[PDB]
Amino acid sequence: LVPRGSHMVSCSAPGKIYLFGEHAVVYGETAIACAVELRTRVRAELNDSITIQSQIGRTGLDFEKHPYVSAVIEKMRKSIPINGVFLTVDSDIPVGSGLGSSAAVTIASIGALNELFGFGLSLQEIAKLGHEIEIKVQGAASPTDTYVSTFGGVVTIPERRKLKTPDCGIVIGDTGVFSSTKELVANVRQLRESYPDLIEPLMTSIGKISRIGEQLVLSGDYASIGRLMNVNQGLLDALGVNILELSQLIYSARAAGAFGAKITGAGGGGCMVALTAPEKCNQVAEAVAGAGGKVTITKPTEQGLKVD
């Protein structure tokens, strides 16, 4: 094959929302993720030393300001030497939120170095490597985020089967309220401990939504996907992870015609998501904006990691 050893290479990897079933996976259940068109992009250039540039600054190998890129380099250079590289990182995935910001930079960086230095990694090896980098950086991590970012589209969890991509707009509304992903996993579990006979069946019912929903994703019945999303949001409210500002955004989106709307990610703050007809995306976005949410307008993405 054609040498490309000096070719500047850019890779991108998407963030993701949950159609159903966040919070339920740890307790054995099925969920359905959808990658979206908000990407982190990483361009890799041959260089005499290691330089990493992003909105945070220009560094060398710096595990404090550039933890993920730095960990990727540290791990891959054990296989094939990396004498030098200039990496430039830019992201359209909103700073913090279950949308997969650290998984996207991890996967894009692996992609870009894979290409530039010829590691010949397949997508499955990339996903597993990414998972490994998040463990190294965070202490402990679920493989789901790096897998969805790698392969893109709609993915059932944890069987990892690809479902047809819906032709819908996605509005993300950020409440601007901070919450700890650990503290909320901690409270779901606790309420679960105090009333086991009540809370266990609820996770079971969220699991059921994905099984019903799989079938609606296949037939493109977005109106029913939306009705289920709404049911799932109510189950999340029963689990204790909703707040007033999330309901505020959710109810505006629904009133403006969204198929459905729900928390995406851990809850307690952060973002909600609305699934809309493409021709109604703007109107839902304006209603969420009107209500004070920080709005991003996006759509599902068919591809995961890609050489741009």
Next chain:
Amino acid sequence: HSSGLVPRGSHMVSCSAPGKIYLFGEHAVVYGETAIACAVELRTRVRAELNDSITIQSQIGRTGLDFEKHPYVSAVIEKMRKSIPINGVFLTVDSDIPVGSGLGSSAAVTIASIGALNELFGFGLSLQEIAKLGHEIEIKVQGAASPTDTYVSTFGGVVTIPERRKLKTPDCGIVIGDTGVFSSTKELVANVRQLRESYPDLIEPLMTSIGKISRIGEQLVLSGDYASIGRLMNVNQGLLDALGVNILELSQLIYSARAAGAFGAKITGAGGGGCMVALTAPEKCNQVAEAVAGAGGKVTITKPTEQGLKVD
């Protein structure tokens, strides 16, 4: 209290009957599940005196017997006349109960009226007979009804439905917050019935989970663990939100009540508007009411009532 004068012969008689909120389980009873209702200290009072004709006076004005303007009082007099003559009577109706949200305004006027004529004319009816009669009256006036509203207004306190088991009354304030948003009970019941129709394998187990709440919560009422009763009311609220009967105004009031320290807060009755309810420590009642008021609601501060129908 009273005047130095003691009347001779026949006196004015007075009965009152309470409204109610649901601690748990609205919407699930019609699906074979348990609920817990709690009668509260908001009453309809009916005063009654012998008269040669019929006169009914209430917040709407003074009439003779009148099935449009006083449909329940007039149906009561009509039904009761079939066993004992009522040549005439003068009836005055007043009430502290707000309309709708299954708070039980119709049930309260029905039961208070029955109770007042019971006393005045010496019908000798027991509580069970009074509730059964009130159930029969609601059927007559609106076409169809469950016996629950009239049962709970007759007996008062905390009652499990449909098993009708009396539970110990809790020592808590109750704040009712009205969103002022109008919605219709039979439309919401229909919309819930439709959702269960579309996903029976999803929705039937959620009903079953609301029934579990009442099961667990019965024991918490027995042991007076109000904090956990609130926490379970919080879970039942998310399940009502899953059933599609919440709205933004209700959420606004509910979060405000919880931030101000309520043990818990939730929709009471049909939803889609109407009222929510918060259970609070007696201390924190004013705190919670001011905050629901602060967030947009018409607030009523009450507490549970131990009995239902009483001769005042």
